[PDB]
Symmetry: C2
Subunit: 350 residues, 2 copies
Amino acid sequence: RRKVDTIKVGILGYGLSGSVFHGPLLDVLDEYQISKIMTSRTEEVKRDFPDAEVVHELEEITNDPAIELVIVTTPSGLHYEHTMACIQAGKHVVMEKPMTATAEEGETLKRAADEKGVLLSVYHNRRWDNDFLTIKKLISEGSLEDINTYQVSYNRYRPEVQARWREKEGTATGTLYDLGSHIIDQTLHLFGMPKAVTANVMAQRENAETVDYFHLTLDYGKLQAILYGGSIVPANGPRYQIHGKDSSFIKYGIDGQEDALRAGRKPEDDSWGADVPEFYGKLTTIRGSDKKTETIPSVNGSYLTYYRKIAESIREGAALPVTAEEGINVIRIIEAAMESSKEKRTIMLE
Amino acid sequence: GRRKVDTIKVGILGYGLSGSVFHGPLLDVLDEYQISKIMTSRTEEVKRDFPDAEVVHELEEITNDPAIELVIVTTPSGLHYEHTMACIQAGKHVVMEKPMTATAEEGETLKRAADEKGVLLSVYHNRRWDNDFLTIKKLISEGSLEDINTYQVSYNRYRPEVATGTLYDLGSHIIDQTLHLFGMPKAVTANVMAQRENAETVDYFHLTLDYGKLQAILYGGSIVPANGPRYQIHGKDSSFIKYGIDGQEDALRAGRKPEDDSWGADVPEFYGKLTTIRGSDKKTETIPSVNGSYLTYYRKIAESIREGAALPVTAEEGINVIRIIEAAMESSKEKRTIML
């Protein structure tokens, strides 16, 4: 039990994740101090964090006694090496998603972290998207009782195949890992693990080889969760269609916090994470013969909450906002989906 | 050879919902048809709607009548095979209510016998003349939906309280529309189940028809307070998204009959949205629906009988629908994809 200093943070990588999705959040929380960043982008780090030291080798973070938390935002195929070496040096770690290519590697990371007394969490921050927070509130207030169908669609319009290096390079490529993990994580958070996965996973784009289409069925008995996304979709349809015994929630659109971060905006006030009114979800409730329909203002998105929560886990022993086991379960779903599509059969989870 | 064209003399089997509401009123407005006979026990309802038709109780009274040319079979599911096979044996043309039969094997035999005797066999897949689907057909033919990669169709309802169940009953309409647009898929993956408490018949289905690059998703549940779009269609530069249901069956239930150009009109609020992308410009356009037109089905049958024209729906088309259903049922039971 000591003086509560700023948490001393090392960031690995300063590309998109590091510089747009993580750095700007940590910068507004004074729980944190960014001490070091492993990156070649020196001029970029100086502009954003005039007092952070830029370093170039992993050991400069890992072997620095002063650093307590490492954010791992480097390319997919370095995730495991970097995180493991952070764990071994006794640092707490936040990993970008997808956690790893396989459940087994995930298992191994979690085991090392518990052995070494350190905190390991995965940046599944779509639990704090405006739309999802809204679904959760609706659930907790009894407006979506006994869900029987849960359909989530994560479509994009990117019909053109990028460069080989961006397509093929590294572990865990494609939209199932990249986009699917968000909405799979949301599903596990709401419902726990299913009995079975059925899935079609493919590249629809001409000359694509890496995955650009997925359609997952998660079997929870009476409850069906259907998770899907294509890369040739000019307009999306609802992002969520949720049916309960008495009510439905249908909602379009995507959380706007990532766009605000890309634009140079920081969570500076209460208007952060606000949804756009024409994209508010519509709730339909049926009471006997009476059918009503009502537009729900979304709860504000709140990515800050993940890091405020991480600070509480580090400083006060609170439960982590996203655990290692939660991270792993998502990877389990993905591997079962990948095997389902290959074997052309339903894969039981054991 | 060619002779005087008087009315096609029709016999209707059954006079419940199908006969009295879905077929009789259509037939009644068309001068090409005359209803001579109806196998039913609802004498008084027939006397009311068709004052000049003779009512009958057993099937032989229609099948052994040389004057009867066409038989509309609107009896229950399990009676389809027997009644139709009897009509064929008697040299009558037949319109079968959907779903055709329970098994493809049963359908093939009806088809093979219809051909041997020399008569026309059709299945009443009138959802090809639903307003939304006609609107999709038009969009396709004018090239507004090129290179379809994803075709998602939902047919939900809210009935939380309880060839059976919804795959046969509802699924067949949208399976048929899919086959009409795309032909036969390579494979069918499906979950087909009973979601309601104490349910004993299929009330939920989720089908994937695999066409390669193209994926067709056909689904429906029975505990759905609000629907979501009925059609989501995506192609290389455009999507079409539409809500709502064709309102012809409702106008028929209300006792209205096709009489002016306003039959089958959609409600503007449910017109589809067509979205098109040109580089960075995203453009969205509300598409007024083509008027639904169930009459077209019987005008077509008339021309087939009188003029040798192609049937509006062929026996083979109906059998293919059943093939998909049997395949979905097997997929669901076996927990695997079924190759066709």
